[PDB]
């Protein structure tokens, strides 16, 4: 572990300090289909003519990124993504920008979002949830070892690749920080109490999120839900959680510690670090080495009739990609 990290941190640091820029152009890609949309940009399936490879291209509207004050966050996402490298993080292949947009081309995951399979199936068996949680556990140990905080863990951001393993996406809130940070961001159902009460938080918010995920993966629903955000936040800070009758005793115990409103006793942020999680009962059956190598039996293998298949993704209206004749936000995004 420590042997592995050390070297990994050295490869990251090099890239971190000298990020690669403009490694492609729009006209080298064939637009195929929008795979998701929202906030200030969208993600499209795309084909690279030189290699004939398919990629997921995230296009961000520079002007919209500015109206939503996400400039630094956006710079955080690309700089971090171009420098990291782990089996459960989706790979950033190319990045560039034009007059109107920012573009990040990444590896296309035909398998779709965990969210979709999770909602369709209802809930995962514990051995199934454990298999996915373990992968997240290792990704956070990797990330945190690099001083990175993820901040938006959820089924919607986890894709299943061809081997049934998870690929984390969306580094919009990722940030390299040593010490306390205060930015209010994330998704309601997953916000640590620290964030909602806006009291300066650290990596511990990621571990709390892992606790919400495991519960949702196993129960079929979030440990804290309601129609309006405010209602949800009152639940998160109450220090009250209920577990379906089917949750094993170890599973209940693991979650009690993970969903610990007392961030000075919450597993992961303790003296023993990630080992308080990796050496927990519910994980005793987990071969942590095996999982990193991907030699463990994947509980579910998504299906695709071929490369470029988008049946595992919903459909969205297809707007057009427009690049103004004038540069829009040069200075704000010069390092991208």
């Amino acid at each position: 572990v420590k042997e592995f990290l050390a070297k990994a941190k050295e490869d990251f640091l090099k890239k971190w300090e000298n990020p690669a820029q403009n490694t492609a152009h729009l006209d080298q890609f064939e637009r195929i289909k929008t795979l998701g949309t929202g906030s200030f940009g969208r993600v499209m399936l795309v084909k690279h003519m030189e290699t004939g490879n398919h990629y997921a291209m995230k296009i961000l509207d520079k002007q919209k990124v500015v109206k939503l004050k996400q400039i630094e966050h956006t710079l955080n996402e690309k700089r971090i993504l171009q420098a990291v490298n782990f089996p459960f993080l989706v790979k950033l292949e190319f990045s560039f920008k034009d007059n109107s947009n920012l573009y990040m081309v990444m590896e296309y995951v035909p398998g779709g979002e965990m969210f979709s399979h999770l909602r369709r199936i209802g809930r995962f068996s514990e051995p199934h949830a454990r298999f996915y949680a373990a992968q997240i556990v290792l990704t956070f140990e990797y990330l945190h070892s690099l001083d990175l905080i993820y901040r938006d863990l959820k089924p919607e951001n986890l894709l299943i690749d061809q081997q049934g393993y998870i690929q984390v996406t969306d580094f919009g809130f990722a940030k390299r920080v040593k010490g306390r940070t205060w930015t209010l961001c994330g998704t309601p159902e997953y916000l640590a109490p620290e964030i909602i009460l806006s009291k300066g938080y650290n990596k511990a918010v990621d571990w709390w999120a892992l606790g919400v995920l495991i519960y949702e993966m196993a129960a079929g629903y979030p440990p804290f839900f309601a129609d309006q955000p405010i209602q949800i936040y009152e639940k998160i800070v109450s220090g009250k959680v209920r577990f379906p009758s089917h949750f094993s005793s170890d599973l209940k115990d693991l979650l009690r510690n993970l969903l610990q409103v007392d961030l000075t006793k919450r597993f992961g942020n303790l003296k023993n670090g990630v080992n308080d999680i990796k050496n927990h009962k519910w994980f005793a059956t987990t071969d942590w080495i095996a999982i990193y190598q991907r030699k463990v039996e994947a509980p579910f293998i998504p299906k695709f009739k071929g490369p470029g298949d988008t049946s595992n993704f919903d459909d969205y209206e297809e707007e057009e990609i427009r690049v103004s004749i004038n540069e829009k936000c040069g200075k704000e995004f010069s390092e991208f």
């Binding site: 996400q70 919009g172 809130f173 309601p188 309601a226």
Partner: peptide
Amino acid sequence: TTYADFIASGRTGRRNAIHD
């Protein structure tokens, strides 16, 4: 059942991130 309350709630679709 909670599962029933969840499925009937307006929060079963993709949840948007928040910031400002």
